C-alpha cells in the first residue's frame, strides 16, 4: 500500500524512500513490484500488479490489461481531481520519485536492473492511448530523468575533482604511495567515466523514447510541463543542455496554439536569462525570436504579456541588441494598458531603459545625485519629452501610475523640476517651453496625487486595499514634506503662471491633500495668505468656469472649521465675496435699465461677476449677502424681454438655486421659524415659475438647466422630506402640477430618447473631437437619470415612466441600463403598479404599431418580434422574486386581457377582436411560470370571449390560440 502510504499523509518522505531502499537490498523483485504498484495506482488504475505477472509477461500487455482493468467509477484521474488531498498527493508523488532516484545515485543506480523495466513501462504508458496513463507516466519518467540529470551533474563534478587530483599527483612524482594514489585516482576516474556513459545511455533512451514523442502530443498540459521543466534544467545544467540540440524543441514549441504552453515557454526563456549572464547562444536565440517575443507581448493572455515584457527586461539586462525602436514604442503604448500589472511591467522596463543621464545602473556617488541641484534634470527632461510624444493621452495618470513604484525616489524629488520650472537653473538650457511647462505641471499633478492617495485610478481599481504601517508612515511623512515644500513653491509658481488658466486649474488640486495643522505647527499662515491674495488676483483676472470651480473647491477644502486657520481664511473669503457683491450690484443696477445700450462691456462684467458669485456660492454659505433680489430681477427681466445672453441667465438661475439650497441648509439645524419659512416657500415658488418659463424658453441648454433645477426643487419637496424626523416642514411641501408633468415628459421625449441624427436636438459628434457624441449621450443619460430619480421616489406619476419603460429595445445600448434599473426599483417600490405600467408600456408600443400599420398589424414583422422579445425579458424579470409574486402577474394578465378586447371590429367581423396581437405579448407572460392561477386567468379571459370565438381556429386568431 505504498500508494496509500505516500498519499494519506506521509510523515517523512525520505523515511519511506529508505524503506524502499532497504526492501530493494533485501530483494529486488518485491521492491520493484511495490514501486510498479505505486505508479499504477498513481495512474488511477485500481488493479494491482502481482509477482508473477510482473516478472514473466511483458509491459505492453500489462498496459493493455490495465487499460481493460482500469475499473473506473468516473472519468477523472488523480492528476485532475479537485484539489487539497490530491494536490498534496501529487506533490508527494513527485517528491517520492525525486528523492528515491536521487538517494540511490552512489551504489544502487549502477546495478542495471530497475531502470530497464521502469523505462520500458513508462515509455509504453506514455505511448498509451489513455490520457491518464500518458500524463502519469510522463510525469513519473520526467522526474526520473530530472533526477538522472542531477546524477549526471554530480558525476561531472566528481570527474572534475578526480581529474584535478590526478593532475595534482602528476605534478609530484615523488613517492611510491603517491603513485599508488595516482593509480587509485585513475581507477576512480575510469569508474566515473563508465558511470557517466551509463547515465548518458539512459538519458538518451528516456529522451528519444518519451520527450520527442510527447512534445508533439495533442495534450497541451504535457507539453507545457515539459517545456517549463526543460527550461528549469537548462537553467541549472548549462554544461550539456545549453545548445541548439535542445533549443530546437523550444523554438518549435513557441508557436503553440495554447496560452499555457506559451506561458511555460516564456518561463523557460526567462530561466535562460535568470539569473546569469552572458552566453552567446542565448543572444543568438534572442535575435532569432525577437519577433516571436514581441508577438507574445501582444498575446491574448495577460500572463503571457507580463512574462514577455519581463523577458524583454531580461534581454535589456543582458543584450540591449535585438529590440528595435518600433518595439520600444509598442511597449511605450503598452504603458497605457488598462491592465495594471502589464502597464507596471512596461513602465519598469521604460525606467530601466531610458534613464541613463548620470545613473549607469550601477553603484552610487554619481548615480542618484552628485551632491548638486543639477544631475536629475535630464531624467525630468525626457519624462517631459515622453509625455509630449505620448499623444495617446492628454494626462500622464496611467504613465505615472506605471512609473510609480519603479521610480519612487525620483518622483519625490520635487525641488529639482521646481527650479527647472521657475527660477532658470545654472545648466544653461533653453527656456522652459509653455507646452513643456503644461506637461511638467500635469506630471506633477499626477505624481503628488498618487503620493497622497495610493489607490490606482478607475479601471486599475481593486478595492481590496490594506494599509501596512510602512505604507501609512511613508504616506504621512510624504504629506509633511510636500506640505512644507509646496507652501513655499506655490506663491512664485502662481506669480510665474497667474494668467495660465489650465495651469492654475491643475495646480489647485494639490491643496486638497494638505494637512492644515502643519500650518499651525509650521507657522506659515502668512504664506497661506500670500497665496490667497495671489489666487484672488487669478480669480479677478480669470473668467473661466473651470478655474472658478477649482478655486471654489480649493477654498472649501481650506474652509475646514476643525482647523484653527478657519477665521484667517474666512477673512479673505468674506473680503473677496464682498468685493464681488459690490461689483455685481454696481453692474446689475446699470444693466437692468435699458439705457445705452446695454453694450458688450457691461454684459461681460455682469456675466463674469455672476460666474464668480455662483461658483463661490456653490461650495460656501453666502446667503448673509442676499443677492436673490438682483438675481430674481435679472431672471424676471429675462422672462419679459428675452433678448440678452444665455450664460447670464444660466448663472443667475444656478446662483438663485444655490441661495435657496443654502437657506435649506439652515432650517434643518434644529431652529426652524415660520415667517422666514413662508418667505422661503414664496421665493421657491417664484423660482419654480421662472424655471417653468425657462423650460418653455426656446433655448435648449436653458431647457436642460431648467429641467435639472426643477428636479432639484421637486426632490427637495419630495415625500422623503418627512423621513428624517421632521414636523414643521409640512407647509413647505409643494405638489407637482399635471401640466408641468406633461411638459417634463414632452421635454424628456424630445431631448433624451433619440438615437438618430434626424431629430437635430443632439449635437453632431461625427468628428472625433472634444465635441463628440459621447458628451451628448452622457448628458442625456444624466437627464434621464434625474427624471427617473424623481419617478422612483413617489414624486411624479409613473404612468409617464411607462413611456420610458417602453423604449427598452429602441434604446438598449444608450439607456437600457437606466430603463432596467428604473423598472427594478419601481418593482421594489410597488410591484403591482410596476407590472401595470409595464403592460401599459407594451400597450403604448402596440398602439404606436396600430397607428403605423393599421389593424392588420403585420404580426410577422420586426416590430411584433421586438415587442414579444420585450415581453419575454419582462416575464423573466418577474417570477418569485418579491412580495405579491403572482398577484402582480395576475393583474398584468387581467390588464392585457382587457386591452386585447378593449376595441371591437366594425366590419369583418363582429367577433374578431382588434388589438388581438397583444395576446401574443401576454402569452410570454403566461408561458409555464405559474400553474394554479392559470385557471383563474383563463376564467377572466373567457369573459370577453364567446363560443363562436372559441370554435374558430385560423390565422387572424392565432394570437388567441397561442395565448390559450
Amino acid at each position: 500500500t505504498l500508494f496509500e502510504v505516500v498519499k494519506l499523509g506521509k510523515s517523512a518522505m525520505q523515511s519511506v524512500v529508505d524503506d524502499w531502499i532497504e526492501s530493494y537490498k533485501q530483494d529486488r523483485d518485491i521492491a520493484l513490484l511495490d514501486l510498479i504498484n505505486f505508479f499504477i495506482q498513481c495512474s488511477g488504475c485500481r488493479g494491482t500488479v502481482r509477482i508473477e505477472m510482473f516478472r514473466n509477461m511483458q509491459n505492453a500487455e500489462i498496459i493493455r490489461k490495465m487499460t481493460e482493468e482500469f475499473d473506473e467509477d468516473s472519468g477523472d484521474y488523480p492528476l485532475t481531481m479537485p484539489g487539497p488531498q490530491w494536490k498534496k498527493f501529487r506533490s508527494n508523488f513527485c517528491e517520492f520519485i525525486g528523492v528515491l532516484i536521487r538517494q540511490c545515485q552512489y551504489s544502487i543506480i549502477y546495478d542495471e536492473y530497475m531502470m530497464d523495466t521502469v523505462i520500458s513501462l513508462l515509455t509504453g504508458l506514455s505511448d498509451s492511448q489513455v490520457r491518464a496513463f500518458r500524463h502519469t507516466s510522463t510525469l513519473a519518467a520526467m522526474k526520473l530523468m530530472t533526477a538522472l540529470v542531477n546524477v549526471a551533474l554530480n558525476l561531472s563534478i566528481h570527474q572534475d575533482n578526480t581529474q584535478r587530483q590526478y593532475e595534482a599527483e602528476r605534478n609530484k612524482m615523488i613517492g611510491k604511495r603517491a603513485n599508488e594514489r595516482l593509480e587509485l585516482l585513475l581507477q576512480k576516474r575510469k569508474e566515473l567515466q563508465e558511470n557517466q556513459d551509463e547515465i548518458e545511455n539512459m538519458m538518451n533512451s528516456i529522451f528519444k523514447g518519451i520527450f520527442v514523442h510527447r512534445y508533439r502530443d495533442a495534450i497541451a498540459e504535457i507539453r507545457a510541463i515539459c517545456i517549463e521543466e526543460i527550461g528549469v534544467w537548462m537553467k541549472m545544467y548549462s554544461d550539456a543542455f545549453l545548445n541548439d540540440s535542445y533549443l530546437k524543441y523550444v523554438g518549435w514549441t513557441l508557436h503553440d496554439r495554447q496560452g499555457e504552453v506559451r506561458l511555460k515557454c516564456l518561463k523557460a526563456l526567462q530561466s535562460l536569462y535568470t539569473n546569469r549572464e552572458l552566453f552567446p547562444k542565448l543572444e543568438l536565440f534572442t535575435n532569432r525570436f525577437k519577433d516571436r517575443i514581441v508577438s507574445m507581448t501582444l498575446d491574448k493572455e495577460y500572463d503571457v504579456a507580463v512574462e514577455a515584457i519581463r523577458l524583454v527586461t531580461l534581454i535589456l539586462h543582458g543584450s540591449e541588441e535585438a529590440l528595435s525602436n518600433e518595439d520600444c514604442e509598442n511597449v511605450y503604448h503598452l504603458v497605457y494598458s488598462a491592465h495594471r500589472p502589464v502597464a507596471v511591467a512596461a513602465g519598469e522596463f521604460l525606467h530601466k531603459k531610458l534613464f541613463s543621464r548620470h545613473d549607469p545602473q550601477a553603484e552610487e556617488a554619481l548615480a542618484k545625485r552628485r551632491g548638486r541641484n543639477s544631475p536629475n534634470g535630464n531624467l525630468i527632461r525626457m519624462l517631459v519629452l515622453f509625455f509630449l510624444e505620448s499623444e495617446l493621452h492628454e494626462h500622464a495618470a496611467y504613465l505615472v501610475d506605471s512609473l510609480w513604484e519603479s521610480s519612487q525616489e525620483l518622483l519625490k524629488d520635487w525641488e529639482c523640476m521646481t527650479e527647472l520650472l521657475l527660477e532658470e537653473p545654472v545648466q544653461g538650457e533653453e527656456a522652459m517651453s509653455d507646452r513643456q511647462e503644461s506637461a511638467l505641471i500635469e506630471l506633477m499633478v499626477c505624481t503628488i496625487r498618487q503620493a497622497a492617495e495610493a489607490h490606482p485610478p478607475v479601471g486599475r481599481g481593486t478595492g481590496k486595499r490594506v494599509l501596512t504601517a510602512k505604507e501609512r508612515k511613508t504616506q504621512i511623512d510624504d504629506r509633511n514634506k510636500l506640505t512644507e515644500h509646496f507652501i513655499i513653491t506655490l506663491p512664485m509658481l502662481l506669480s510665474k503662471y497667474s494668467a495660465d488658466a489650465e495651469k492654475v486649474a491643475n495646480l489647485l488640486q494639490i491643496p486638497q491633500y494638505f494637512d492644515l495643522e502643519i500650518y499651525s505647527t509650521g507657522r506659515m499662515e502668512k504664506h497661506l495668505d500670500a497665496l490667497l491674495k495671489q489666487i484672488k488676483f487669478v480669480v479677478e483676472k480669470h473668467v473661466e468656469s473651470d478655474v472658478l470651480e477649482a478655486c471654489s473647491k480649493t477654498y472649501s477644502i481650506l474652509c475646514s472649521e476643525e482647523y484653527t486657520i478657519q477665521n484667517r481664511v474666512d477673512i479673505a473669503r468674506s473680503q473677496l465675496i464682498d468685493e464681488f457683491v459690490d461689483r455685481f450690484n454696481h453692474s446689475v443696477e446699470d444693466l437692468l435699465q435699458e439705457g445705452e445700450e446695454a453694450d458688450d462691456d457691461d454684459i461681460y462684467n455682469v456675466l463674469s461677476t455672476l460666474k464668480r458669485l455662483t461658483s463661490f456660492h456653490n461650495a460656501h454659505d453666502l446667503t448673509k449677502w442676499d443677492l436673490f433680489g438682483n438675481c430674481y430681477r435679472l431672471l424676471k427681466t429675462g422672462i419679459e424681454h428675452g433678448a440678452m445672453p444665455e450664460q447670464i441667465v444660466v448663472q443667475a438661475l444656478q446662483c438663485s438655486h444655490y441661495s435657496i439650497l443654502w437657506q435649506l441648509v439652515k432650517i434643518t439645524d434644529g431652529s426652524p421659524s415660520k415667517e422666514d419659512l413662508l418667505v422661503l416657500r414664496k421665493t421657491v415658488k417664484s423660482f419654480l415659475a421662472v424655471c417653468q418659463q425657462c423650460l418653455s424658453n426656446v433655448n435648449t441648454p436653458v431647457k436642460e438647466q431648467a429641467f435639472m433645477l426643477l428636479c432639484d426643487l421637486l426632490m427637495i419637496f419630495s415625500h422623503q422630506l418627512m423621513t428624517g424626523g421632521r414636523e414643521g416642514l409640512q407647509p413647505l411641501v409643494f405638489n407637482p402640477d399635471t401640466g408641468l408633468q406633461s411638459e417634463l415628459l414632452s421635454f424628456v421625449m424630445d431631448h433624451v430618447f433619440i438615437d438618430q441624427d434626424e431629430e437635430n436636438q443632439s449635437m453632431e459628434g461625427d468628428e472625433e473631437d472634444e465635441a463628440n457624441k459621447i458628451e451628448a449621450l452622457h448628458k442625456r443619460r444624466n437627464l434621464l437619470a434625474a427624471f427617473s430619480k424623481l419617478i422612483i421616489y413617489d414624486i411624479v406619476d409613473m404612468h409617464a415612466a411607462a413611456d420610458i419603460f417602453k423604449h427598452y429595445m429602441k434604446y438598449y445600448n444608450d439607456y437600457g441600463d437606466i430603463i432596467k434599473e428604473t423598472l427594478s426599483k419601481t418593482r421594489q417600490i410597488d410591484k403591482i403598479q410596476c407590472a401595470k405600467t409595464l403592460i401599459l408600456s407594451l400597450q403604448q408600443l402596440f398602439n404606436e404599431l396600430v397607428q403605423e400599420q393599421g389593424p392588420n398589424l403585420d404580426r410577422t414583422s420586426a416590430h411584433v418580434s421586438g415587442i414579444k422579445e420585450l415581453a419575454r425579458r419582462f416575464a423573466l424579470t418577474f417570477g418569485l422574486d418579491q412580495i405579491k409574486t403572482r398577484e402582480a402577474v395576475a393583474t398584468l394578465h387581467k390588464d392585457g386581457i382587457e386591452f386585447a378586447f378593449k376595441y371591437q371590429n366594425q366590419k369583418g367581423q363582429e367577433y374578431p377582436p382588434p388589438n388581438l396581437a397583444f395576446l401574443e405579448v401576454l402569452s410570454e407572460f403566461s408561458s409555464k411560470l405559474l400553474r394554479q392561477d392559470k385557471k383563474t386567468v383563463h376564467s377572466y379571459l373567457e369573459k370577453f370571449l364567446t363560443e363562436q370565438m372559441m370554435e374558430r381556429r385560423e390565422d387572424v386568431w392565432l394570437p388567441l390560440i397561442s395565448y390559450r
Binding site: D244, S245, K248, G251, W252
Partner: peptide
C-alpha cells in the same frame, strides 16, 4: 541554421 530545419518523418 540547417539543424533547426524540421524534416522529421
Amino acid at each position: 541554421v540547417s539543424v533547426y530545419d524540421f524534416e522529421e518523418e
